Amino acid sequence: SGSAQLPQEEKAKIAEQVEIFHQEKSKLDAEVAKWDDSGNDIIVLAKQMCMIMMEMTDFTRGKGPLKNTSDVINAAKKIAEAGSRMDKLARAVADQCPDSACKQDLLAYLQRIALYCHQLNICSKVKAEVQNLGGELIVSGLDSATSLIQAAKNLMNAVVLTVKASYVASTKYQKVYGTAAVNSPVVSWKM
Amino acid sequence: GSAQLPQEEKAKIAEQVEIFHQEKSKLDAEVAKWDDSGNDIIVLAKQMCMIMMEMTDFTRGKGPLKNTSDVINAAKKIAEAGSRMDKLARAVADQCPDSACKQDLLAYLQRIALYCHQLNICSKVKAEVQNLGGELIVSGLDSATSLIQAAKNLMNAVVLTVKASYVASTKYQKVYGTAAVNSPVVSWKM
């Protein structure tokens, strides 16, 4: 077989990066716990994106339904689709919002999501090459999964702050126009 | 964030490089005999030899190729040359009045087309990561050896074709004399 395992240093580097990712997913479960799902697709989408980023982390330690690079490339494209639908929703929430400090906070978090979705797309290549460098034949791109996790941790972080900022933007819309406002709030926040 | 090949696989490369140097020496031999000029078959044979040296050296940490894309480009150059060589020996084959020889040269000319193709395919030297048996493993580390093998097979067919081209010109002259109305397409001077 022309196959070998990743070197222990990189395996440990992978593992320590997946715990960092689990802390941020903890935060996401905490935040979404509080809220009923019906009438809130921001919450549903955040859960979907977390579900997939879970397949992607599992991949890097040897578990989950992701088997080859094109699986990982596929996962990243789903996350980006779900993020794009989150952007549309949250954007609409920001347009109802009358408090500009919170309108602008929400819109800024949407930039982070677009950015980290992009970087997740790039990193999902987990590309590996043989290279003739420095007088030796070497394999490079062994950290390609370490960079994949750090993209997911960053995206996971931005999603949490985006859900929080969508809720704040919502309370300010109701604060100003009331729960009988002629136009209903874009998403509902119940328990 | 990089690593060197397993010794298990480094060893398997150096040994397939050895079989390659062997076949290269047969070519180096046969080419010292002759004189470049008026013989583009010889010239093309050496061009194919140098690029293949570039390709084997890559697998040993040496030479100019650094990327897969360099290896792929080398294999493209090699097939370009093999194509220019096929044109030349094809003409030499048409001249051959003997048919046991015309056939041989056309046969080796088809082994070249074959191995140029297999070299092209192998020059990708692709490496994957995948999730297999609860592990993160790198695959495709045996790519270098398939590349050398294809180089060696190509090398051999070049030696066969250079020799068979000499012999096919020899038989063109035994029959139509060193005063033949049409010169031999290739000239063989020591």
Numbering used by the authors:
A (entry chain A): 670 to 860
B (entry chain B): 671 to 860
Per the authors:
The cadherin-catenin cell adhesion complex is the major building block of AJs, and has a crucial function in the dynamic behaviors of epithelial cells, such as cell polarization and cell rearrangements. The structure of α-catenin (100 kDa) consists of three distinct domains. The C-terminal actin-binding domain (ABD) (28 kDa), which is connected to the rest by a flexible P-linker region28 (2 kDa), directly binds to F-actin, and closely resembles the vinculin ABD (vin-ABD). The direct interaction between α-catenin and F-actin was demonstrated to be a catch bond, an interaction that is stabilized by increased force.
To assess whether the α1-helix affects the α-catenin-F-actin interaction, we performed in vitro actin cosedimentation assays with three ABD variants of αE- and αN-catenin (αE-catenin residue numbers are shown): a wild type form of ABD (ABD-WT; residues 652-906), an ABD with a structure-guided helix-1 mutation (H1) designed to unfold α1-helix (ABD-H1; RAIM670-673GSGS), and an ABD with a partially deleted α1-helix (ABD-Δα1; residues 671-906). We observed a nearly two-fold increase in the cosedimented amount of either ABD-H1 or ABD-Δα1 compared to ABD-WT. To examine the structural details of αcat-ABD with enhanced F-actin binding, we determined crystal structures of αNcat-ABD-H1. However, unlike the monomeric αNcat-ABD-WT structure, αNcat-ABD-H1 crystallized as a homodimer connected by two βH motifs. The dimer interface involves L807N of the βH, which mimics M673N of α1-helix interacting with the hydrophobic patch in the αNcat-ABD-WT structure. Moreover, the observation of αNcat-ABD-H1 dimerization, which occludes 3100 Å2 of solvent-accessible surface, in two distinct crystal forms provides a basis for further examining the physiological relevance of this ABD-dimer interface. Our NMR analysis of αNcat-ABD-H1 in solution showed that concentration-dependent chemical shift perturbations (CSPs) mostly occurred in the βH motif. In addition, we performed chemical shift (CS)-based Rosetta comparative modeling (CM)48 to show that V796N of αNcat-ABD-WT remained in the cryptic state, whereas αNcat-ABD-H1 displayed a large conformational change that exposed V796N on the surface, resembling V796 in the crystal structure of αEcat-ABD-WT. Our αNcat-ABD-H1 crystal structures revealed an unexpected ABD homodimerization, which can facilitate F-actin bundling in vitro. It involves the βH motif forming an extensive dimer interface with the hydrophobic patch uncovered by α1-helix unfolding.
